Design an enzyme around this catalytic site. Structure first.
Site, PDB file in Angstrom:
ATOM      1  CB  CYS A   1      -1.132   0.083   1.249  1.00 35.55           C
ATOM      2  SG  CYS A   1      -2.281   1.249   1.051  1.00 35.55           S
TER       3      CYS A   1
ATOM      4  CG  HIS B   1      -4.482  -3.678   2.308  1.00 38.98           C
ATOM      5  ND1 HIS B   1      -3.991  -3.215   3.275  1.00 38.98           N
ATOM      6  CD2 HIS B   1      -4.889  -2.760   1.491  1.00 38.98           C
ATOM      7  CE1 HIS B   1      -4.015  -1.849   3.290  1.00 38.98           C
ATOM      8  NE2 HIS B   1      -4.424  -1.669   2.095  1.00 38.98           N
TER       9      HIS B   1
ATOM     10  CD  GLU C   1      -2.618  -6.172   4.893  1.00 38.11           C
ATOM     11  OE1 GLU C   1      -2.858  -4.887   5.051  1.00 38.11           O
ATOM     12  OE2 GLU C   1      -2.412  -6.487   3.633  1.00 38.11           O
TER      13      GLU C   1
END
Ligand SMILES: [Cl-]
Ligand SMILES: [Cl-]
Ligand SMILES: [Cl-]
Ligand SMILES: [Cl-]
Ligand SMILES: [Cl-]
Ligand SMILES: [Cl-]
Ligand SMILES: [K+]
Ligand SMILES: [K+]
Lengths: 379, 358, 358, 379
Positions: free
Chosen positions: D268, D352, D354
């Site tokens: 990001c 992302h 994650e």
């Protein structure tokens, strides 16, 4: 689990549940026997710095509402009760007790042996205390806090609660039907009363207005001079926390008014002040009078009135000047309840004639004051 | 709580109305409403140990009976209110049928939810903390037992183990604002105890009969008072146990010490525990106290006068027959039938007309 | 929501289980579940305007039937659930019986409460702030009206008055992150309208039958598509109104404009209002749109093909016989009995065997 | 009636109801299309200063729980939704959404045409706005507050969210079964990674540990030197609000790392950093990427991943230095998503990996990174 704990000076510990804001509270602990009227008691400025314990187990049964507020805010330092009801159940309710306390940020504890607490305060006299509400209340901290407390015993409370600038009051009492009335117009009230704000209860004002008085609420430090300047019909000395020093401003101004022919009437602290200003002495009571079922005898007519009481200090009857005649005494303990200046148009009552909460038996004290006013205005 | 006797008037309208139909009443004191109500329920002498169910959970028709009992109150309404929460009804639902203030309903509801947890964790889940919370809500050992699926004695065992006992508070007319010299007490699950028993005198304890009912009247109470008055005069420290608000027995002047409590084994044992009396009279308050006699004795109480076993000899049909026999006395010809056809035969034996006691 | 036909199989086990028994299904789109839910109910074609009641409030046996319907689901449960709420059963009580997530149940309860307001306040209490609240909840004009004791029309007018009308949003698969050219819409009571009707073309409206049921199958849906496919081919602007998720008619590719909505007078009117079509075909979707024909027309709908009146001519037993009569054609003897003894006579007349239509 | 109101730069009004704290909020307004993951979105640092609008109508169906906080606190400015559910219904719930909003003192508004709003942003581009919740919200003030906003563009946000001092992170991911694990012992984690907190999401850390990484989380402004001193196994550049200006500290630092053989991985914000430091330029997007259904193609394998997106800025694929290859691209709009240094062990993804909330599709990104560290160590 929301733990809460209360510890006394003497180290006594009460373990229970938190029902209000999170944090700690310290003050002189008092018990009140009133079965009804909790909101009114909590919003009474005379309970400033004090931690209020109520003897009646169930507190919050009827929730709360604005009309039952005796001032602009909760004055109790903390609240101690046996049981917080699951629900408030009354058409008047506008907010449950817990949310209210929270709202006002009061630390409160429930589920403790309030009878043991009360028996203890009765037996050993008032004591300082601290309530701690939180995840893991530290009883040693609470004990510290309680022990450290300077206490009331030589504190100027009234200055704390009094008004900053003077103001006008012309609203009358609440009624089932109409609720609290819109405030009257100046021209709708024949008498002008100047009332010393020592942490005055709304009900006293309302009741005076009910009787014809338009009010001018003045700061406790207000000078006799400035006052007289307003050309009062009568002077009123409000109720309030603590006790006044022989020392202090107010006694001074009072005495002045007393040189004059203006009628003076005092309730509670106001009665104290009147007696101090008249050369009488005040004492701190073991535990005091906090309840609504207190028998007061009018010695003059030989009659008994059930009264609302809220006071830790009392007027020495032994130290009573000769220009001070005894008008009422307690039937519970025999303590001085009311006096009248033989020489002047001034009188006072230790109890709360305006009740709120409590029985209305003592209301007529207000009427003697009106009489007084009416005569003064005749001359 | 009023005491009824409808079962004795079969064809009577048993609905409650503006005309009284009650024959008595019990009273209880508690530090809380929950505590006070439950204590009254267990002292009512109707076999209740608190909120005992009236209808089953798997009865498809339950809601209907419950509904009926809530809308048109009979003597059983209090138990149908809880049954209602058990079955799914809301406080608002109950309210609309009964017009009982929700302030009360919410309280009963909470009791039911508690009972549910109990039933769920069973005896093992009865840790000291939890058991104390229950006691505090006025739960009887008998009721907890039932939910836990054990004998009452087991609940009581547990209490002894946790040293979970009540304290006694005093009635003072003033919420403790002034002290009292009178000994008018009630049990509660709190901190400070005010019983302060004497160690001085020889004590006798008299058990009352709880609320009056038909056949269990004032007569028994009369006797109870006399015992107290007599033994007091004779030098004993007299202790009265009773919860009937209408009688002379629960008048504080009648005895040295008054315990305004449920006349049950649980209640009486707690008191005995601290008073340690010399003797306990169980023969004057009628059926209520009589029925406790054996358990009391068995648990260690110094019951005096006619013995528990003796009393049993007489009351028991078989034991008695036997005695009558032994004395060679006259006793109506009897039989102890089991079945229909058995009796008919036996009847034949005994002879009409017959008296058929169940 | 699934559509059943248990009334066609009297002897059949009507409890819902692991084997499917439903015959069709309806689908709805709302901005909220409550909206979505109610729209679906009113588009079900079972005569429901939403949560219409199954049992009377003053039925002493109602909780029982409620309980049963709730514990052993049938096609009617959805309704019995609201009824549970009307009767005072709690959200939790309903949960234990049905196992339906409380998240849903709560919503139902809310709807039952508003309803009650309605019923209390009457038409007068129908301000425009409330009415709009009611509308965003998916309440239908017809529902409110029963509640308010008025004609559906009244509510309809009222809205008109308040200028209370739905808006149309579009389906795009991407929550508005991107723009669409398709015109697959649904109604809701929001702010911005996305309909954006064309002023441009001659528009023809096709009404579908809603969910399938026996006797109102795919055959009707077949015709409806064909209408669109044909006219659209001919150059008309075709607009489909249907809410059956299984069909070709509700495939956005089948028409110019698709309104996935309940085939109701109310929802239909609404579409017309802004579309102002040239004509509307109500002769292709089965019984659904056909029953709407008179109403639509009187409401000023430009119904094309055989008139609603005409229709009635044929359907109406009396109007038909009459015309049969007029053309001088053969029809079986008939009669219109009211009483038992009546028919038995008329029966003699007509002649067995007979065909008894209710 | 608890009134609420949101107003846009443009003067577009949205009336509603207050569901959060009382008062006002101001910031850039965005929309996020995620039908699940509302809590994880709210607690995202990347949302700082921003006003969040969620497309999915029912927000708060599953209430809230600690395990779903991606950060120590609620970073979004205001919350804008269509409907707040009567209850939360989830075994994981610990506190309802309203309650939580208030607890976190957030200003939030429900019952508004979030569709309208979304379409407006889409069409017109991102806009600053102000929500007003209170007794009688003022439209003009709102409007005032709306226009007066300096806005994100040209704002150092990261600094606002980064940690004061440095710390060690050794916590793994959550499990249905086990929930949040106890932080791993440092002697249990084979690699050492140095991570730059630009307003880093917990999940990121969790997944690295999961991967064998022992983390040393450092302030934003930390110098390349103080770090190179730690003898890292790789260096990580977290996500975070706003965008970096070619001017700032990290740019400089990163470049240093780029002179080294230390593997470098950015996400990001860090993906943009890595890019800036590599010679490219960034651009502010029309409305950005906020949702969890975003397709992105791995141009090398020719495979698509559904990904979690939260980023208003973008790396101009046009300005790319030659040492910068294209790895991923957005299937929605063709914008740039991933890159790799041809020269160095450096790579960064714009989405992302994650997630939290969203598809685990981009997880393998991390594996690359580890692949790099392993190799670096080998050498
Ligand atoms: Cl305690
Ligand atoms: Cl009768
Ligand atoms: Cl427990
Ligand atoms: Cl309204
Ligand atoms: Cl809006
Ligand atoms: Cl850690
Ligand atoms: K306690
Ligand atoms: K609105």
């Amino acid at each position: 689990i929301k733990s809460a704990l209360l510890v006394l000076e003497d180290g006594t510990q009460f373990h229970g549940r938190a029902i209000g804001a999170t944090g700690s509270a310290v003050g002189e602990v008092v018990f009140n026997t009133s079965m009804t009227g909790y909101q009114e008691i909590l919003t009474d400025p005379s309970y400033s710095r004090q931690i209020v314990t109520l003897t009646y187990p169930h507190i919050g049964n009827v929730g709360t509402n604005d009309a039952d507020e005796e001032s602009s805010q909760v004055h109790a330092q903390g609240l101690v009760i046996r049981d917080l009801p699951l629900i408030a159940s009354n058409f008047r309710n506008t907010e449950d007790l817990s949310s209210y306390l929270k709202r006002h940020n009061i630390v409160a504890i429930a589920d403790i042996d309030t009878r043991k607490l009360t028996r203890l305060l009765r037996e050993k006299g008032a004591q300082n205390g601290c309530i701690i509400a939180g995840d893991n209340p530290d009883a040693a901290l609470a004990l510290e806090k309680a022990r450290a407390f300077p206490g009331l015993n030589g504190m100027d409370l009234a200055k704390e609660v009094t008004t900053a600038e003077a103001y006008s009051w012309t609203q009358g009492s609440w009624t089932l039907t109409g609720g609290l009335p819109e405030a009257k117009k100046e021209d709708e009230l024949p008498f002008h009363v100047v009332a010393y704000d020592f942490g005055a209860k709304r009900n006293i004002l309302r009741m005076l207005v009910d009787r014809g008085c338009r009010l001018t609420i003045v700061p406790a430090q207000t000078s006799a001079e400035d006052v007289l300047k307003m050309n009062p019909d009568g002077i009123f000395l409000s109720n309030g926390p603590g006790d006044p020093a022989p020392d202090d401003y107010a006694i001074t101004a009072i005495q002045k008014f007393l040189e004059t022919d203006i009628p003076v009437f005092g309730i509670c602290l106001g009665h104290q002040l009147l007696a101090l200003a008249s050369g009488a002495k005040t004492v701190k009571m073991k535990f005091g009078h906090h309840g609504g079922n207190h028998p007061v005898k009018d010695v003059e007519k030989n009659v008994v009135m059930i009264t609302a009481q809220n006071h830790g200090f009392a007027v020495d009857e032994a130290t009573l000047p000769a220009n001070l005649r005894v008008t009422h005494k307690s039937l519970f303990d025999g303590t001085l309840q009311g006096i009248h200046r033989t020489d002047k148009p001034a009188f006072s009552f230790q109890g709360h004639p305006e009740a709120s909460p409590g029985p209305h038996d003592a209301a007529p004290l207000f009427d003697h004051f009106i009489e007084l006013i009416e005569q003064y205005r005749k001359t | 709580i009023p005491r009824f006797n409808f079962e004795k008037f079969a064809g009577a309208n048993d609905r409650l109305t503006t005309q009284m139909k009650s024959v008595g009443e019990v009273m209880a004191i508690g530090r809380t409403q929950q505590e006070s109500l439950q204590k009254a329920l267990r002292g009512l002498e109707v076999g209740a140990t608190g909120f005992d169910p009236k209808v089953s959970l798997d009865d498809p028709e339950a809601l209907t009976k419950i509904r009926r009992e809530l809308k048109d109150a009979g003597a059983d309404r209090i138990w149908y209110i809880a049954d209602a929460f058990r079955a799914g009804l809301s406080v608002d639902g109950v309210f609309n049928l009964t017009n009982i203030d929700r302030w009360f309903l919410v309280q009963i509801e909470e009791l039911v939810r508690l009972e549910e947890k109990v039933a769920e964790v069973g005896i093992t889940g009865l840790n000291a903390d939890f058991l104390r919370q229950l006691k505090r809500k006025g739960f009887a050992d008998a009721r907890l037992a039932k939910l836990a699926g054990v004998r009452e004695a087991e609940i009581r065992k547990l209490r002894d183990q946790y040293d979970l006992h009540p304290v006694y508070k005093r009635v003072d007319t003033c919420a403790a604002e002034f002290a009292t010299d009178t000994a008018y007490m009630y049990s509660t699950y709190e901190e400070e105890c005010e019983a302060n028993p004497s160690t001085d005198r020889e004590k006798i304890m008299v058990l009352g009969g709880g609320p009056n009912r038909i056949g269990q009247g004032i007569e028994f109470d009369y006797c109870c008072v006399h015992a107290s008055l007599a033994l007091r005069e004779d030098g004993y420290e007299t202790i009265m146990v009773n919860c009937n608000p209408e009688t002379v027995s629960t008048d504080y002047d009648t005895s040295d010490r008054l315990y305004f409590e449920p006349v049950t084994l649980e209640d009486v044992l707690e008191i005995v525990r601290i008073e340690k009396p010399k003797g306990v009279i169980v023969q004057y308050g009628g059926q209520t106290p009589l029925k406790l006699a054996r358990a009391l004795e068995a648990a260690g109480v110094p019951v005096i006068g006619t013995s528990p076993d003796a009393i049993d000899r007489a009351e028991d049909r078989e034991r008695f027959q036997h005695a009558v026999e032994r004395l060679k006395l006259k006793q109506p010809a009897n039989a102890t039938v089991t079945a229909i056809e058995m009796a008919v035969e036996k009847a034949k034996e005994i002879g009409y007309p017959l008296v058929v006691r169940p």
